[PDB]
């Protein structure tokens, strides 16, 4: 599962292949927050 997200706090397009959505959800949040604080 291939799952497409921007973060603002960037301006970067990040896309997350992950066999698991269990993996995704971590991935994507975890992408997210460290662009919004790094």
Same mark, same amino acid.
């Given at each position: 599962q291939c799952y497409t997200f921007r973060s =603002?706090? @960037?301006n970067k397009e990040?896309?997350?292949c992950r066999?698991?959505?269990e993996e995704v959800e971590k991935e994507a949040r975890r @992408?997210? =927050?460290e662009e919004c604080r790094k």
């Open positions: =603002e706090c @960037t990040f896309t997350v066999p698991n959505p @992408t997210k =927050e």
